[model samples]
Target chain A: DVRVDKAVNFIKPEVSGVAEIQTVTGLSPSTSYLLTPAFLEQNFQSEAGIYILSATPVEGEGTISINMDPTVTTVSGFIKVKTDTFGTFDLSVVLTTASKKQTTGFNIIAAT
Target chain B: TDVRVDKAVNFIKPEVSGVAEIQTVTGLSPSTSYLLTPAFLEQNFQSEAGIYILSATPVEGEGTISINMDPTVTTVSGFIKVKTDTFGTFDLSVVLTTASKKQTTGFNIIAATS
Candidate 1:
């Protein structure tokens, strides 16, 4: 039973193939990619000032949840960025999710 | 004749135990812009006394006043000029000798989609 006082945005993928979930914080110039050193190089381009959170990665496609503390009011969607990568023999899909509320009730911290 | 008045910067940073005095003026012409007194400050904010200053008077249409103090500073004490305007308003300035708590989660960024 957790409630954030501020308004926050989130992303969730429904009915998708194998995919990995990583949480990124901060913005473009300075960011935590939420991925390991190895995985980041393989996916992202030029890791100049981007930080990847590898310790906690969401593998497989289910639902990625993001919760915000109680002190925000509708964050700027364009400011936040996300990527969804999944491999399937013939082709691979790397999708960037948009910014929105967590209506699905998926806890990002809880996923293992 | 009185042209030796001191002035302070808007965002004045006083030493830990520094003392500064901001002077308030008594008479002035409406059309003319006269700088207030206590221009130079001597910050001595130690234990007993703290770096003090004269309160800034809000301009004509200024309603809300925002005073930004250093987070490291825990205690601040001073008196503000009160005229007929603020007489009826009951406001007290209390001493906060405790401490400023760190914003554990300065702020959190959330991202979700499904």
Candidate 2:
């Protein structure tokens, strides 16, 4: 999990064995990891009533987004992933608006 | 310094007194008006400074709610109208619950002109 500060606007889960999305078992035996947009959006949508916006995946990769909560001074979120293999992975996200922009990342290990 | 958001829920920490600049916080243009409310009284508070049903939207005293904003960006609520003279900062006061009505730690407003 990641903590959001009023000074900055970025959010994402960790991609480590001890983190939130610590798995990468693709659909096939040799399937590569793919962090879908729907998966990333639904998981890291809101924290402490703080919501994120324009959460598009980076180059269509793992998962990440920008924190878009106006009232919530500070908050955080987690990253979720689906995998077929058991190894290591990373997700990157970029939060952007007309006047502001931020980037963050997450890590996951699929051993299950 | 404040971190303003174009369209997001912003939090205001309670302060002692005085005015603050909105431009320093979030980079949004000067704001004409802003919505205020206490997290504790979130359910009872109203976005507007008006009266309403006593049962569901019951307020303290006559119309002493927890939050309110100025009429225009340059117009203050009472004597403290919007600070149109400048382009960066605005002064305002915030309060808490009805029991004590504690003041906010600090406050600020952004210019609509950017």
Fnat, model 1, is 0.00
Residue-level lDDT tens digits of model 1 in B52-90: 222233232111111212212211111122221222221
Q: Classify candidate 1 by CAPRI docking class.
A: incorrect
lDDT of 1 by residue, A28-86 (tens): 32211211010000211112221111122333222122112112211101111223332
Q: How far off is residue A83 in model 1, in Å?
A: 52
What TM-score goes with each of the models?
0.17, 0.20
User: What's the i-RMS for candidate 2 in angstroms?
Assistant: 19.0
Clashes of 2: 40
Worst 10 residues of 1 chain B by lDDT: B101-110
Off by over 4 Å in 1: A1-112, B1-24, B34-40, B49-55, B59-114
